[PDB]
Design a protein around this ligand. Structure first.
Ligand SMILES: Nc1nc2c(ncn2[C@@H]2O[C@H](COP(=O)(O)OP(=O)(O)O)[C@@H](O)[C@H]2O)c(=O)[nH]1
Ligand SMILES: Nc1nc2c(ncn2[C@@H]2O[C@H](COP(=O)(O)OP(=O)(O)O)[C@@H](O)[C@H]2O)c(=O)[nH]1
Ligand SMILES: [Mg+2]
Ligand SMILES: [Mg+2]
Lengths: 180, 180
């Protein structure tokens, strides 16, 4: 997680940004945070049934929560979407079953108005698993090629080995830097 | 935090103790930990698949992980078992289908020679739901009475109102101070 500090120690212009990482639960999001080695994973429960994990590195901060079948139900999600310039959606590639439901939660967030210019990175995760759908059918199943007017990218990962996180985050780091 | 800080005040100095707090998933452990207000909830993952939440209050550390995994007492658990003085088991009182499974996981834990000297506090959590089993039924379905040569106490709680937490920890904090 030093090669990971080298991507984000350039954005470090102190305006205070947020990268969102979300997905159905058991996708691999906490594992991916832990591998980046950018700081402590610290949990808060802003309201009941809303567990938020956050690694803060410099002015930058990753923010993770599960989606799918929305808690008690509350989105102060929107006070989170504010300063969001990157959105990562982690998907369990092995899970052909709830695959169409991640589609839904993906589409619900993109339909969100404060995430109009946020860049999208999809991690098709659990690639080491034998049934794991390849990136090509994750894209198919997520309807990603129907996204006109959004800057997006799908990256095959295995968060336990760490395979794919640099490359996906390298890209993501590009777009944020390259614009504003 | 404040009130809860002062219970854990005579256990201080050099001793470097651990209170384990385990139980099935969705029992209410991160919720309880967040209520304590003793420090930030830091997650680590010391090995594949094994998330562990920790709140250090000085020399007192609260360690959390879910039990019931599919099947397993890990070599790594038993290293945690070494400086565990107290052990909190948290039961979703409304979860009637998995309480027996709650029983074996706890029966499994107490069979560990590293834990033989540990004070057991069962929080019978989620006592605000209509269908919740009360402390009397729980004591039953876990069989707290068959327990010889162990110091135990069962305390009905509501993690989200924070109700019940003080008295179970009042008691536990004494068992580690005045006895022990
Ligand atoms: N085979 C395989 N398992 C993974 C991978 N990433 C995460 N896992 C496992 O998936 C489970 C859920 O991970 P976790 O980070 O806690 O999930 P989340 O926060 O619910 O999405 C844990 O058992 C992880 O070890 C992966 O790429 N490959
Ligand atoms: N109704 C009710 N639910 C609770 C209570 N305490 C915890 N929960 C909920 O049960 C779910 C799991 O809580 P959590 O702290 O994350 O679980 P654990 O860490 O997996 O043991 C969440 O929706 C919590 O809000 C309670 O006392 N009453
Ligand atoms: Mg998580
Ligand atoms: Mg938890």
């Amino acid at each position: 997680g030093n090669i990971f500090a080298n991507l984000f120690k350039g954005l470090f212009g102190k305006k205070e940004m947020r990268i969102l990482m979300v997905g159905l639960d058991a996708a691999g999001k906490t594992t991916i945070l832990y591998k980046l080695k950018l700081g402590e994973i610290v949990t808060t429960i802003p309201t009941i049934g809303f567990n938020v994990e956050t690694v803060e590195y410099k002015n930058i901060s990753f923010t993770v929560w599960d989606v799918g079948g929305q808690d008690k139900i509350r989105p102060l999600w929107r006070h989170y979407f504010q300063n969001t310039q990157g959105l990562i959606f982690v998907v369990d590639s092995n899970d052909r079953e709830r695959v169409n439901e991640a589609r839904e939660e993906l589409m619900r967030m993109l339909a969100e108005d404060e995430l109009r210019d946020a860049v999208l990175l999809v991690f098709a995760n659990k690639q080491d698993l034998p049934n794991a759908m390849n990136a090509a059918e994750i894209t198919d199943k997520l309807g990603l090629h129907s996204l006109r007017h959004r800057n997006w990218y799908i990256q095959a990962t295995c968060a336990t080995s760490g395979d794919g996180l640099y490359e996906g985050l390298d890209w993501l780091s590009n777009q944020l830097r390259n614009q504003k």
